[PDB]
Amino acid sequence: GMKRLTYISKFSRPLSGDEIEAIGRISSQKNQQANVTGVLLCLDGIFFQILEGEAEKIDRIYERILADERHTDILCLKSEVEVQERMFPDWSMQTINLDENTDFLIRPIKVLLQTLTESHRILEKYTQPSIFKIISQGTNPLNIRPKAVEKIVFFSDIVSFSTFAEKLPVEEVVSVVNSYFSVCTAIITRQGGEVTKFIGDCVMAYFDGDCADQAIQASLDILMELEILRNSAPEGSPLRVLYSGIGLAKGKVIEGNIGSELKRDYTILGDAVNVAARLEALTRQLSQALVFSSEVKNSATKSWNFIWLTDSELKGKSESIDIYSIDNEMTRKSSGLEIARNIGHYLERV
Amino acid sequence: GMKRLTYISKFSRPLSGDEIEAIGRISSQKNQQANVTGVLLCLDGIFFQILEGEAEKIDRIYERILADERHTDILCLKSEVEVQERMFPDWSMQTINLDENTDFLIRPIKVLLQTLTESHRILEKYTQPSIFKIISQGTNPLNIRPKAVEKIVFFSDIVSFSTFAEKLPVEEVVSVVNSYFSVCTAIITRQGGEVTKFIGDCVMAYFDGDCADQAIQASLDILMELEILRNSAPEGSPLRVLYSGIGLAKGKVIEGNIGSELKRDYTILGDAVNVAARLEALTRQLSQALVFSSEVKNSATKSWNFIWLTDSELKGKSESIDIYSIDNEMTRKSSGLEIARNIGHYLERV
Numbered sequence: 001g002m003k004r005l006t007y008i009s010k011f012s013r014p015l016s017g018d019e020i021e022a023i024g025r026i027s028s029q030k031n032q033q034a035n036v037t038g039v040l041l042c043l044d045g046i047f048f049q050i051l052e053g054e055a056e057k058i059d060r061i062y063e064r065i066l067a068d069e070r071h072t073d074i075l076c077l078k079s080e081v082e083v084q085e086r087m088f089p090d091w092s093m094q095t096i097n098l099d100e101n102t103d104f105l106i107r108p109i110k111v112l113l114q115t116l117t118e119s120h121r122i123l124e125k126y127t128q129p130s131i132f133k134i135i136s137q138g139t140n141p142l143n144i145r146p147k148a149v150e151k152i153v154f155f156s157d158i159v160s161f162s163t164f165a166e167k168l169p170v171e172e173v174v175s176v177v178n179s180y181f182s183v184c185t186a187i188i189t190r191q192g193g194e195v196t197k198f199i200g201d202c203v204m205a206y207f208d209g210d211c212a213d214q215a216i217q218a219s220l221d222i223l224m225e226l227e228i229l230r231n232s233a234p235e236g237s238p239l240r241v242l243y244s245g246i247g248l249a250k251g252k253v254i255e256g257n258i259g260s261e262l263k264r265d266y267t268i269l270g271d272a273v274n275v276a277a278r279l280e281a282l283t284r285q286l287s288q289a290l291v292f293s294s295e296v297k298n299s300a301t302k303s304w305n306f307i308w309l310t311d312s313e314l315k316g317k318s319e320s321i322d323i324y325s326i327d328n329e330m331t332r333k334s335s336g337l338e339i340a341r342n343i344g345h346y347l348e349r350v
Numbered sequence: 351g352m353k354r355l356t357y358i359s360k361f362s363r364p365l366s367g368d369e370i371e372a373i374g375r376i377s378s379q380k381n382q383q384a385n386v387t388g389v390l391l392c393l394d395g396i397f398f399q400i401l402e403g404e405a406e407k408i409d410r411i412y413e414r415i416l417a418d419e420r421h422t423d424i425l426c427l428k429s430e431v432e433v434q435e436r437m438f439p440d441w442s443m444q445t446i447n448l449d450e451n452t453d454f455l456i457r458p459i460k461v462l463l464q465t466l467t468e469s470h471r472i473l474e475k476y477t478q479p480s481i482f483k484i485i486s487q488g489t490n491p492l493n494i495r496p497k498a499v500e501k502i503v504f505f506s507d508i509v510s511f512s513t514f515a516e517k518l519p520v521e522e523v524v525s526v527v528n529s530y531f532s533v534c535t536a537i538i539t540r541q542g543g544e545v546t547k548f549i550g551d552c553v554m555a556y557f558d559g560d561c562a563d564q565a566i567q568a569s570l571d572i573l574m575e576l577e578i579l580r581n582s583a584p585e586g587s588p589l590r591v592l593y594s595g596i597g598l599a600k601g602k603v604i605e606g607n608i609g610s611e612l613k614r615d616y617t618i619l620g621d622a623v624n625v626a627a628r629l630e631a632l633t634r635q636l637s638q639a640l641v642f643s644s645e646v647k648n649s650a651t652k653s654w655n656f657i658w659l660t661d662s663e664l665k666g667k668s669e670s671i672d673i674y675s676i677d678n679e680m681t682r683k684s685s686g687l688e689i690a691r692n693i694g695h696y697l698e699r700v
C-alpha cells in the first residue's frame with residue numbers, strides 16, 4: 001500500500017537559502033531512487049514536507065528525517081495509508097522557499113500559513129502527545145471505537161501542597177509545581193508510560209497492563225530525583241521541601257471518542273477520583289512514599305524487594321486488598337503530621 | 351490603537367464562486383468606509399480572513415461577521431493589539447478563491463493549508479475553549495503570569511458508575527457517559543461557567559467567585575434535565591438509571607503557565623482530588639443530589655430555599671463546615687445502597 005505523511009518542523013539552527021536548496025536537490029535524488037515523491041517548503045525557520053510512496057520506504061526515510069540534526073520539534077500532522085494515487089507524481093522532491101517568494105497572491109497565504117502554524121504550536125502544548133501518536137499512526141482520534149483495556153494507573157501528589165500556597169507568593173508556588181510536574185512527566189515518559197492529566201497537584205498516568213515493572217521503576221526514579229532535587233537546591237529554596245506520595249493500581253480504562261462534543265478525550269477511568277483519593281490517604285497514613293496494590297505487585301516480573309504494609313480498599317467495593325511497597329533505603333522513612341509541620345516551619349522562614 | 355484579527359470558519363451551506371466574490375466586493379465597500387483592510391480566502395468550504403483597523407471598528411465588524419448565517423464554527427486564531435502598521439494597506443478587502451486558483455506553486459500550498467486546518471480542527475476538540483478565549487483577547491496563553499483567584503468549583507459524578515461498566519457492553523458505557531458529559535457541559539456553559547476537565551466520570555468546572563447563584567442554578571438545571579432524560583428514554587435504555595451527584599465549594603485556584611513543558615494548562619486547584627472525593631462522599635451519604643458548602647451558600651445573593659444538612663470537612667483542614675442543599679421536590683429523595691441495587695437490577699435486565 002502507498003503511504004503519505006505530512007509534517008512540520010523547526011530549524012534547529014539558521015539555514016541559508018542555498019543550504020535549503022541543496023537539501024531539496026539531494027532529497028530529490030534519493031527519493032527518485034526510492035520511487036518516493038513530495039514537496040518541501042520553508043517559511044521563516046519552519047519546514048513543511050509532504051512525502052508519498054510505498055509505506056516501507058516512506059518509514060525508512062522518515063526515520064532518517066527524524067534523526068536529521070538540522071531541524072527539531074518534528075510533528076506529523078497527517079498520516080494516510082492505502083493511498084490510491086500520488087499528489088505529486090512528477091516531484092521526487094520539489095522545493096519551495098517561501099521566504100524568497102514575492103508573488104502577489106502568495107504573500108497573504110504566507111501570513112496565514114505562519115499564523116496557522118504558530119497557533120498549532122500553541123495548541124500542541126495544551127493537548128496530550130497521545131493524540132498525536134494516534135495521528136501519526138494514520139487514524140483520526142475522533143474515529144477510535146470503544147475498547148476496554150487494563151492499565152497500570154499511576155497517581156502521585158505533592159505532600160502538604162496547601163502549605164506552599166499558604167506560605168509562598170503565587171509565582172513561587174507555580175515554580176514548585178512546574179518543577180514537580182516536569183520531573184514526573186520526563187521519567188514516566190522515559191519509562192514508557194503516558195501522563196493523561198493533572199488533577200490539581202496530582203499527576204495521573206497510565207502504563208500498559210503488563211508494564212508494572214516499568215511503573216515501579218518510574219516511581220522509584222521519581223523519588224530518587226526528588227531527593228536529589230531537595231538536596232541540591234539553593235539555600236532557602238522551596239524545592240527543599242518538595243516531597244511526593246505515589247500510588248499504583250490496576251484499572252479498567254475505556255478508550256474511545258469520549259466527551260461533550262464541545263470537549264473530547266480518548267480515555268476514561270471510572271472513579272479515578274476515588275482511587276486517587278484512597279492512594280493519597282495511604283501514602284499519608286503509612287509514611288511510605290510509594291504504595292501499590294496486590295494486582296500491581298503480582299503483575300510485576302522482576303525480583304523487587306516487596307514488603308507487605310497493610311490492607312486497604314481502593315475501588316469502593318468491599319474487597320480488602322493487600323497494599324505493598326518496596327523496602328529500600330529511600331522508602332525507610334519515619335513519619336505523618338511531622339512532615340506537614342516540617343514543611344510549614346521551613347517555608348515560613350524563606 | 352490598531353487591531354488585527356485572523357479567523358477561520360466553515361461554510362454552513364454550499365456557496366458558489368460568484369456568491370463568494372460578492373461577499374468580498376461588498377466587504378471591500380464596507381471596509382473602505384470604515385478604513386479597515388484585509389484579505390478573504392476560501393478553500394473547499396473553509397473561509398480564512400484577516401481584518402485590520404481601528405480596534406473599535408474591528409470589533410463592530412467582527413460582531414457582525416460572527417452573526418452571519420453563511421458560515422459556522424468561527425475560530426479566531428490570532429488577535430493582535432497595538433499594531434504598528436497594516437499588512438494589507440491597499441486592500442479594503444481582497445478576495446482570493448483558492449478553489450479556482452490553478453497556479454503551479456499554489457497547488458501544494460493549498461494541500462498544506464487544508465491539512466493544517468483539518469488538523470487544527472481536531473486539536474480544537476481536545477483543548478479547553480478557555481485557551482481560545484485567552485487567544486481571542488489578544489494574549490498568548492503561554493504568557494499568562496501567575497494569579498490567585500477565588501472560584502466556585504463544581505464537581506459532579508455518575509451514581510454507581512462502576513455498575514454500568516460491569517453490566518453493559520463498552521460501547522454503551524461510552525454512550526451513557528457522553529450523554530452525561532453533554533448535559534453537564536451545555537448547562538454549565540449556558541450559566542457562564544467553564545468545564546476544566548473530566549476526572550473519570552467526574553465533571554470539574556469553575557464559576558467566577560461571585561457567581562454562586564449561577565453555579566446553583568446550573569446544578570438544579572442539570573438535575574432537572576437528567577430527570578427528563580431518564581423519564582423520556584426508550585424502554586430498556588441505560589439512560590433510565592443515569593443519576594448524578596453534584597457538589598459545590600469555593601477554591602483558591604492559581605492561573606498561570608502551569609505544567610511540564612511537555613504538557614501545559616492555564617489553571618491549578620490544589621487538592622482538587624480530595625475536594626471531589628469528599629463531595630462525592632456527601633452526596634452518597636446524604637441521599638441528596640446537590641450539596642454545597644457554607645461559603646457557597648453565603649456567597650449566593652438570590653433567595654434560594656436553602657436547607658442545612660450536616661457538617662463535613664472538605665479541605666483536609668480540621669475546620670468543620672456547614673453543608674447545605676436546596677429543599678425542593680427534586681432534592682426530596684429517599685436513599686444510599688438502595689440506589690446502587692436499583693441501577694444494577696435494571697441494567698442486568700437490558
Ligand SMILES: [Ca+2]
Binds near residue numbers: 158159161621
Ligand atoms: Ca495533594
Ligand SMILES: [Ca+2]
Binds near residue numbers: 320
Ligand atoms: Ca490482606
Ligand SMILES: [Ca+2]
Binds near residue numbers: 271507551
Ligand atoms: Ca463516580
Ligand SMILES: [Ca+2]
Binds near residue numbers: 661670671672
Ligand atoms: Ca456546623
